[PDB]
């Protein structure tokens, strides 16, 4: 499990797992410890209900850009595990959720 450190107010731009191959529909999730995971980013730009404008991914237009997830202005409550389910076209089906990254907030 790869850790990551960020402070209060800084734009946390966490990385992804495997390399992007062709088209992309990334699936970003915030897995809280003990609770249920929450959907954050689907189809590289869209957000579901209950999520503000802070959580946003990179839209895959003119491929060659790596997939990241920007968290602008983090708090103490939004400090949990993160997953990046990479769905592409040159690998077929995706059965694993990739390498989980753990966000840590100092303070």
């Amino acid at each position, epitope marked *: 499990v790869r850790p990551l450190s960020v402070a209060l107010g800084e734009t946390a731009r966490i990385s992804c797992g495997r390399q992007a191959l062709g*088209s992309r529909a990334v699936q970003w999730y915030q897995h809280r410890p003990g609770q*249920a995971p929450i959907l954050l980013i689907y189809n590289n730009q869209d957000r579901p209900s209950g999520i503000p404008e802070r959580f946003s991914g990179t839209p895959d237009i003119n491929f060659g850009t790596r997939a990241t997830l920007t968290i602008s202005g983090v708090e103490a409550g939004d400090e949990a595990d993160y*997953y990046c389910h990479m769905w592409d076209s040159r690998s077929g089906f995706s059965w694993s*959720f990739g390498g989980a990254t753990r966000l840590t907030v100092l303070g």
Partner: nanobody
Amino acid sequence: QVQLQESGPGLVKPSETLSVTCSVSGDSMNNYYWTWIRQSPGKGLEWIGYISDRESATYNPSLNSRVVISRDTSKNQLSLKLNSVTPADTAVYYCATARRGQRIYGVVSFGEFFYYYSMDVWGKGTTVTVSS
């Protein structure tokens, strides 16, 4: 509201099946594609399979095909049955749903589209610990 109660057994033995349940009341006719998602200590979130109206439940290749599934409209619920358990399978088994959306990258008559699975509504998850 999608209600998802988890009446799992909790304490299982080797050479015993699973009986974790999830019953949905509400907007649950055919569109919300249900699935099973687990979380072990150390091992990440393993998407072990889903079930649709086509009755083709594709399972995980790392699961080694030891899981049969059962969704019925008489009891109005979804159950899981895992056989020949291992002591590293002390996981929290969530019963969530997904929406299968396509991503077109070319011509639709040439098969240039692939499907993803976006999990939007989640459940609680019960702590089924394998006891030897």
